[PDB]
Amino acid sequence: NLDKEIGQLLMCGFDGLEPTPGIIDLIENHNLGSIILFSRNIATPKQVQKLTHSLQQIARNAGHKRPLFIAVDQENGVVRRLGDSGTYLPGNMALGALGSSTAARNVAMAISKELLTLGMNWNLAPVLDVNNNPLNPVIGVRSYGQDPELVARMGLAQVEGYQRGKVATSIKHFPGHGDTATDSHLDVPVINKTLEELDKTELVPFKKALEAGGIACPTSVMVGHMLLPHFNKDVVSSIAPEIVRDLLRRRFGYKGVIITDCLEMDAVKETVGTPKGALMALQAGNDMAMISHTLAFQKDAFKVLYSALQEGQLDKDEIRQSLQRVAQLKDQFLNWDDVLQQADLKTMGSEAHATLSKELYDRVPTVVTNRKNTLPIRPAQTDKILFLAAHVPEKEPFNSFHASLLKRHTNLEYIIYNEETPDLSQKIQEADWVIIGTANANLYPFQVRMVQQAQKLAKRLVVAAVMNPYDQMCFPQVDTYLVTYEYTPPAHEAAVRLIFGEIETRSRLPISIPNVDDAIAPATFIVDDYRNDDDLDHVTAMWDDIFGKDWPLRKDKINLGLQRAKLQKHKVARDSQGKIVGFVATQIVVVDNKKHGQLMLLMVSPSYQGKGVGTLLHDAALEHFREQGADCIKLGSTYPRFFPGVPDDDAQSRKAQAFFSKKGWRMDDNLVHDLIGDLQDYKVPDKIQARMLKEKIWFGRIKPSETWELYAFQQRNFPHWLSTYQHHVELGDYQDLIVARQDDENGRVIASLILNTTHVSHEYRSDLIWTDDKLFGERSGGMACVGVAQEERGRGIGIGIVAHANWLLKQRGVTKSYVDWVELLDFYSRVGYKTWRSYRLGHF
Amino acid sequence: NLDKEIGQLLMCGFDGLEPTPGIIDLIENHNLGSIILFSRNIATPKQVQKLTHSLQQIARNAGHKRPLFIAVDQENGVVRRLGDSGTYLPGNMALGALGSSTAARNVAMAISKELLTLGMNWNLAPVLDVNNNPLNPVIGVRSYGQDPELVARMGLAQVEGYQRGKVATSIKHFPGHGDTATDSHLDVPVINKTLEELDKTELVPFKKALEAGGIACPTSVMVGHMLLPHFNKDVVSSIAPEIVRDLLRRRFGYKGVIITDCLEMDAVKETVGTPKGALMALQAGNDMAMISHTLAFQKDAFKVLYSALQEGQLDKDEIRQSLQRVAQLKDQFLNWDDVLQQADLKTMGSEAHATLSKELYDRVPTVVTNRKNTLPIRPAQTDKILFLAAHVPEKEPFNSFHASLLKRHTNLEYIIYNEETPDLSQKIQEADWVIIGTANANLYPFQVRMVQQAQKLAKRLVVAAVMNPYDQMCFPQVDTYLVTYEYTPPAHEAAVRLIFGEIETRSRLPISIPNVDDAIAPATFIVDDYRNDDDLDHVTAMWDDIFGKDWPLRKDKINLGLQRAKLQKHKVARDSQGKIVGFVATQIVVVDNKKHGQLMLLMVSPSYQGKGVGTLLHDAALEHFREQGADCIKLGSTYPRFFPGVPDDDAQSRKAQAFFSKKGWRMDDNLVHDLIGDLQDYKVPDKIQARMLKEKIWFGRIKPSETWELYAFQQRNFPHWLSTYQHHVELGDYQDLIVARQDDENGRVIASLILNTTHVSHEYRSDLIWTDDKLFGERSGGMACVGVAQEERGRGIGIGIVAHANWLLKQRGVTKSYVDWVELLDFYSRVGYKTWRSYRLGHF
Numbered sequence A, B: 001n002l003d004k005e006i007g008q009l010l011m012c013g014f015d016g017l018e019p020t021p022g023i024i025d026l027i028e029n030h031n032l033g034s035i036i037l038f039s040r041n042i043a044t045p046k047q048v049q050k051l052t053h054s055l056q057q058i059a060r061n062a063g064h065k066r067p068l069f070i071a072v073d074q075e076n077g078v079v080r081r082l083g084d085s086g087t088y089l090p091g092n093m094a095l096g097a098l099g100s101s102t103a104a105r106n107v108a109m110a111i112s113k114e115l116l117t118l119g120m121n122w123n124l125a126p127v128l129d130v131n132n133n134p135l136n137p138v139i140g141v142r143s144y145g146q147d148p149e150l151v152a153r154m155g156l157a158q159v160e161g162y163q164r165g166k167v168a169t170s171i172k173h174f175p176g177h178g179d180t181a182t183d184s185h186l187d188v189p190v191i192n193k194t195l196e197e198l199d200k201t202e203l204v205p206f207k208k209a210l211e212a213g214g215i216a217c218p219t220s221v222m223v224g225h226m227l228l229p230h231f232n233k234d235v236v237s238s239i240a241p242e243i244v245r246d247l248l249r250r251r252f253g254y255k256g257v258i259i260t261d262c263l264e265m266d267a268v269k270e271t272v273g274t275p276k277g278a279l280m281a282l283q284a285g286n287d288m289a290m291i292s293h294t295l296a297f298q299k300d301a302f303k304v305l306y307s308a309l310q311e312g313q314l315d316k317d318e319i320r321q322s323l324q325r326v327a328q329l330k331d332q333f334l335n336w337d338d339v340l341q342q343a344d345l346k347t348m349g350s351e352a353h354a355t356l357s358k359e360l361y362d363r364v365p366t367v368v369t370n371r372k373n374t375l376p377i378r379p380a381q382t383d384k385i386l387f388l389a390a391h392v393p394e395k396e397p398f399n400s401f402h403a404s405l406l407k408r409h410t411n412l413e414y415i416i417y418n419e420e421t422p423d424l425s426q427k428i429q430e431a432d433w434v435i436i437g438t439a440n441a442n443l444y445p446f447q448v449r450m451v452q453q454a455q456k457l458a459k460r461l462v463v464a465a466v467m468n469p470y471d472q473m474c475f476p477q478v479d480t481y482l483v484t485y486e487y488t489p490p491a492h493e494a495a496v497r498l499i500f501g502e503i504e505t506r507s508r509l510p511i512s513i514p515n516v517d518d519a520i521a522p523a524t525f526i527v528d529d530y531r532n533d534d535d536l537d538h539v540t541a542m543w544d545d546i547f548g549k550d551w552p553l554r555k556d557k558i559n560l561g562l563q564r565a566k567l568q569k570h571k572v573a574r575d576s577q578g579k580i581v582g583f584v585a586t587q588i589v590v591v592d593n594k595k596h597g598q599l600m601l602l603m604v605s606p607s608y609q610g611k612g613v614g615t616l617l618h619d620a621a622l623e624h625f626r627e628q629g630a631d632c633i634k635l636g637s638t639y640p641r642f643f644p645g646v647p648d649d650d651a652q653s654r655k656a657q658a659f660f661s662k663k664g665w666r667m668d669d670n671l672v673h674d675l676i677g678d679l680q681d682y683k684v685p686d687k688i689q690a691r692m693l694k695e696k697i698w699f700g701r702i703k704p705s706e707t708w709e710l711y712a713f714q715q716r717n718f719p720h721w722l723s724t725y726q727h728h729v730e731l732g733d734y735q736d737l738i739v740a741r742q743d744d745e746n747g748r749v750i751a752s753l754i755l756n757t758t759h760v761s762h763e764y765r766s767d768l769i770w771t772d773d774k775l776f777g778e779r780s781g782g783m784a785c786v787g788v789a790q791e792e793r794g795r796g797i798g799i800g801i802v803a804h805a806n807w808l809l810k811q812r813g814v815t816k817s818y819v820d821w822v823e824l825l826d827f828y829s830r831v832g833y834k835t836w837r838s839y840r841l842g843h844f
């Protein structure tokens, strides 16, 4: 009935660097729909492309309707299956400490690119567990931090990032594994909390992800293994319908794929059979069962499901809906052509991703205490440095630390200390500097003793914790302590750079360290909602301060720009004393029925630039868009607008272009221009008069009863402008809506454009805001949305109607004319317009 | 201015039950604007009225422009000044535990009523401090609870309630005194937190309150005395401009009054002079200084300000702004007539408030643990009960507790234990039941010993913590433990009621008790936003369960009512398993440019009524209105609409009316009716045909070009209906818009009404939803917004246009006609309408 088809509901691993006979059977006979891989299987880039293609080949020959999913746990920091095949980029708490959702988004994009070229098309990530427990072993630095809002902010960003690169996601571990001291792999963790308690922390990031507007909403959710007595005290969360069906499916109304964590962990293997745990998972409402590692359970589980399917121990109607959800998920990401074609090995962003890693990691480690100003250290060449590193329970992970120390200082001793290590007192007292490397000392007593010992003896001690940042809770006497949030080579490089004062701590602890309350606070800026009643004068002053030379702009024009923005969301940045230091403007517009986010303006005061304020505001902007589902984002705005893209005619502006591309904005190669035209003594050239006379073209306004003819025109020929014409009509600016007609005032509309003139057009028209005496004057105007019908092209009408528009402006007393956002410079050269300012567009 | 005027910026108290020469001097000569009273000054209702009236007269007599403010700390739990002059109603944590914002609002209203009648017109309250510290001596139960969101919720509701009752407020203590173990009256409390930290908890309730839309936004804010080293490490927040101006005035942009806590507290007096401190307070940016007790300081402080005014040590410009803010505030609440009248002491709601006290306190105390099912106790008359209570550091608080037990049991011994108390072991073992009253045992070790002692010896133990609820942290072994949240007499009464099983625990701990993980969790219901894609069928089902008998209503009509709701915010209530058990519907509409909140519908499944679900949904709705500033609230809705008020034709609906009035809704004495009229064979009466023909009145549809004539009519004569007409015009239903014109189809508009007809009117018209075969059926229609110009009344037009309306409807094939929400029954009786259903309206 559904015997072969139920293979799509599974995900299974294997051992080695090429397909086993096991998984070949499962795929070919039992229609297995998803694979999972680990470092065991990741040989190296060439081997993996082959491996993924091999599995894919066998799947197609075996007659699968859709291609396999090939999943992996790529969380990036401490946990990372790529190894040396792919780039080291910051893991979760590292990113949390870094504090930029944009940074995290980019990391996920960079990773998905790498995974997709190798054949991975499903990253089991991100982790949305919240780390409010100092002693959490399993989810330590795998969580972004202690604050559920920070976890949401960063989580959404990565789900976007990964899925933006055509790779599926799984937010985990539902309902929240971050609050326990118990490890899921070893024992059964208990979360003794009610739904009300869960709503306040655990579920915050999950709720926010599920409610995301578009690409930032995850495509699957993973249910970990934890006991929740207030919901189900008999069985673990993955197989309890109170957690899966009642909470995730019913309450939250989640329509996507639900999958389990590995059913071979002791939390479910030592409560029931892993083949039994597979049945109870799908009974609870899971769409999918995970069985990584040991084949035998994979065989059993399959036969367990077949028999249960015969009885009626599985609701056949529910399994159909599950198979439907898995089909939908596959159709979103998978197609046979490019799944088999494979991409070239150089299409991994290896070089670009490498320079991202260097750039990010310099902003990661935190100096937590520095009571004696030991850091930065500036030893003399002949000073003896003792570097003591803890043993690990990857093999010698503190060797990269050692390497990085060597680049700065060679008179160095490197010892890996453990429980057995003979007494090192004498070395500690003799050395001029002692550096100790802890790795979860708060879980490994020998490290705490080592640090406490050295504290008594060392001349100058510094302690770097490279796993969880909580270690100093065990030795608060230590005056100088820092954290790297992960033991990766680049995290150690950055940690050494920090120690030698090459770099400066910019990150902020995403965590509380118990018994350590004098944490060092960097200068912090906070983002509030813009309040026009209170903030307008300051924003006005900021504009003149930054743009006043080339773009002087009075308070009311700024206010017009800002107050008329659709679905607006403007923010300011304030220092600790509430003084405004930066501003960002923002609107959302619908085009083709896609939400479009427009970043209208981003600016910060000169004396406060280069402190991360721009980045704060910028992230607040994209985080808002992200939640709203504004997935197509633009630099500058259409209407209303300060700039259509990024100014190009001064250095500070071009510098701001680099700022934006470096964050991930795709800037255009070519420029875009605003034109200026003198009309002092403008006459319509005779050739055009004669042409328009010969063609029998009529120009003039549209009347209210004729509006439909102008809308009909725009709908057929320039639908992207209809809303602009409609906006003016709402204000009653009919005198600015000029049309060309055939023969006379009753002929069909064959062309049109939008005039504007200072003091004539409605006060809420932002067509021309540059009315300062040093730019365009009082006696100023312009035109826009110029267009001729397709049928009527090549009769000289376009140049006619523009030339007429110039005449009309001259009639109104206009001496200086503004043609905004155009490219055909030779066209407007024929009627006296030379270029005024240039911009480079950007989008995302 | 300016020296006389500065007295308006001061608040001073005094000794006795009549004016001292001291304050008489301050009022008469120094222009003191505000008084503060304490228990010293309150003896009895009669004498307080005489006191407030005397103070008020002297101010009037002495030539004050505006009345004195008369302030008091009336927090209602452990902090009260009224004593027995006013009703005992639940203090803060009692209300947090109770869990209803409507209950907190209703308390404040009752208290502001009692205060005003005595001449007290400023309550220094509510406390928005968040109590996340288990050891907090000041601000224990004075805080609503641990969750800042709960504190905001209740805080807004009380600020509404007090100001609703024409009494001023001061939210306190900015920036948030909830997190310390140090007491402000004794020593300087330190809050070592950054702005970013404070924003997470301390400042949440203050921000929520400051951003409230209308009456729930507070009119003053008090700044406590606490050291914040990250902002200012030299002086306490009261006199630190980094807290007062930079944070409250600039960053939050608050425009109301800022006032200090008492400048006589040791935090201010023992750091710097109390006179000196008043100068620094106004320098920091405070509007108003408090000096509650000592005449010498009140005298000196004034002398310090007069000299400070001379130099220019005070920004004179800033003082004028302050004086204007005080003037603003006084003008909002105070006028000489009411302030000099002494309202009858019958107009204190004493008997009603007594009833409220009883009703609420039954929903207050919580049974926290009851492992042995000791509660409820059922002692035989001859059993011996021993009651041991802690000494206080009032009188003998647990006394009332003693009196309450006596009523249930005669054989009872009562001993107030302390440190000196000789051993009591013998009586404990001998007693059948032992009851121990603790009063912050976690602060007083002798109580912990006493409980530990009894834990082993006593036969059957129950422990009642009557101050802070945290006491069981000191003795988790105790199986049977309850808490009252305050030692007021009715809190104790309710506690005893719970002990003997007369009542049952309905509250939930608003707090976490350390070392007690097994709290008795009652079965709870959580409220989410209504999702129409998931919940429509269930809400439709729920409708049929509850109203299906007399009001059968199809899904699409329910969906129309709900989706067309303006500024909608609908909620559902689920149980732990996500099953929907209740629904509330809501919209906001603007009339006279005030926001009007409309409670469209409130319903819960029958099997789930009487479990607090209606209250949960109800409060969620009122919290939303309160925040939005929708201060005029209605039962039912205008357009769209299920009901215009509460139905009256069945018992369940009449019972639901009681439900609303108990919560404080004002229900009308009279009813309001929907009408039904059979048109099967209707004819226009001959007398009316004549009258119309005689008055030469013309009827017919309004044409699009004539729309302005209809709007002009409605504007001049029925402004409250304009928006409904406009709504129908947007849909294009001109064929339902009938007018009366003078002679002719071109005559002035003199009357109008709105028709509707099933399958003829636009699909989004909700005029008539009752189209079920058993109600009005498919051949159905109606009229609304029937109105004759005031200059044209008594020409039989009203009856003419309505008689015409029936005719037109009959022309359409309508047999049953719906006239909704009317009163003039005899009028519609003349055209064959009898009453169909009746509703009682309700407002707040």
Ligand SMILES: CC(=O)SCCNC(=O)CCNC(=O)[C@H](O)C(C)(C)COP(=O)(O)OP(=O)(O)OC[C@H]1O[C@@H](n2cnc3c(N)ncnc32)[C@H](O)[C@@H]1OP(=O)(O)O
Residues within 6 Å of the ligand: A504, A506, A546, A599, A600, A601, A602, A603, A604, A605, A608, A609, A610, A611, A612, A613, A614, A615, A616, A635, A636, A643, A645, A646, A647, A652, A653, A654, A655, A656, A657, A658, A659, A662
């Ligand atoms: C569509 C439009 O909005 S167009 C208008 C854009 N505005 C302008 O053209 C002119 C005004 N420009 C500005 O206000 C600013 O220069 C902005 C908005 C472009 C950037 O604001 P800033 O606060 O300087 O940004 P931020 O401080 O995050 O700068 C990031 C860079 O500064 C450096 N930096 C930031 N903080 C630190 C720190 N604590 N220590 C050392 N270096 C730092 C980094 O190198 C970082 O990356 P990059 O050098 O690779 O670019």
Ligand SMILES: CC(=O)SCCNC(=O)CCNC(=O)[C@H](O)C(C)(C)COP(=O)(O)OP(=O)(O)OC[C@H]1O[C@@H](n2cnc3c(N)ncnc32)[C@H](O)[C@@H]1OP(=O)(O)O
Residues within 6 Å of the ligand: B504, B506, B546, B599, B600, B601, B602, B603, B604, B605, B608, B609, B610, B611, B612, B613, B614, B615, B616, B635, B636, B637, B643, B645, B646, B647, B652, B653, B655, B656, B659, B662
């Ligand atoms: C605009 C319109 O909506 S028109 C109104 C139309 N709606 C209806 O008529 C629907 C029919 N009625 C109902 O659905 C419900 O009865 C409602 C909505 C009126 C009230 O909902 P309920 O859930 O019953 O209210 P709730 O349970 O909060 O309180 C009801 C009573 O039970 C009591 N109660 C609640 N929980 C408990 C408990 N755990 N133990 C003991 N008593 C309790 C309350 O104190 C209250 O007592 P009171 O009668 O002395 O005031």
